[PDB]
């Protein structure tokens, strides 16, 4: 007597009128004239924006910093829209359209002569940011496959997550820190300048606490 169990119900769920991902423009409608500095800190460290679920229950979670150009947006849109079920699934963008101008110098020129002309636009992303959020009358197992395919093709480490798997990830990290048997931790040593270590550390390491190196996030660091 194989034991059946109640199936989850999505009767209360409601699908928006426009289920598919909208088109993202290559560049802003009004082109930016003022050229901007490189500002690499915009992809460094933990994300503070779009870290929580809003409408849907599934998403792709960033595990590193990087820039998303228009080519990436097209890969995400075409892959998700083609793979999703419009009747039962809806997808929203959790990242703005490319807005940061990247300059390039003409090929073959030497160093100097002023800054280069604007070439394309990118969207900076930090680790911990939800990039695309999906919802509807479906389970994570249904969308995990194609969401993982999209995540693999991003220019930074990424993984498809759900409300449950995302919370378990955070709970596991908190538990590891609480039950860690190493008496020495990066935070304690750095914040106290033990061994004069701050001579080889960045001021950002007081808050990054050894979990972030450049644009890379180390999930196994406690």
């Amino acid at each position: 007597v194989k034991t059946l169990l109640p199936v989850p119900s999505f009767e209360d769920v409601s699908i928006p009128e426009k289920p598919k991902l909208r088109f993202i423009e290559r560049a802003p409608l009004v082109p930016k004239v003022r050229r901007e500095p490189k500002n690499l800190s915009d992809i460094r460290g933990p994300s503070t924006e779009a870290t929580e679920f809003t409408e849907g229950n599934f998403a792709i979670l960033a595990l590193g910093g990087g820039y998303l150009h228009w080519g990436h947006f097209e890969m995400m849109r075409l892959t998700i829209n083609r793979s999703m079920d419009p009747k039962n699934m809806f997808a929203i963008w959790r990242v703005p359209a490319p807005f940061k101008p990247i300059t390039r110098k003409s090929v073959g020129h030497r160093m100097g002569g002023g800054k280069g002309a604007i070439d394309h636009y990118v969207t900076p992303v930090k680790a911990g940011r939800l990039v695309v959020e999906m919802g509807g009358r479906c389970e994570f197992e249904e969308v995990q496959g194609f969401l993982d395919q999209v995540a693999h093709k991003l220019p930074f480490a990424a993984k498809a997550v759900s409300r449950g798997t995302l919370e378990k990830m955070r709970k596991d990290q908190e538990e590891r820190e609480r039950n860690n048997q190493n008496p020495w931790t990066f935070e304690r040593i750095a914040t106290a300048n033990m061994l004069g270590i701050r001579k080889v550390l960045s001021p950002y390491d007081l808050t990054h606490k050894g979990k972030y190196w450049g644009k890379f996030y180390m999930p196994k660091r406690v």
């Binding site: 003409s106 030497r110 002569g113 002023g114 800054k115």
Partner: peptide, 18 residues
Amino acid sequence: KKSGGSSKNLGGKSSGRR
């Protein structure tokens, strides 16, 4: 050898007022 451009930003050389 390619012929390069020039910077269009002039001025901005004032010293600090102390």
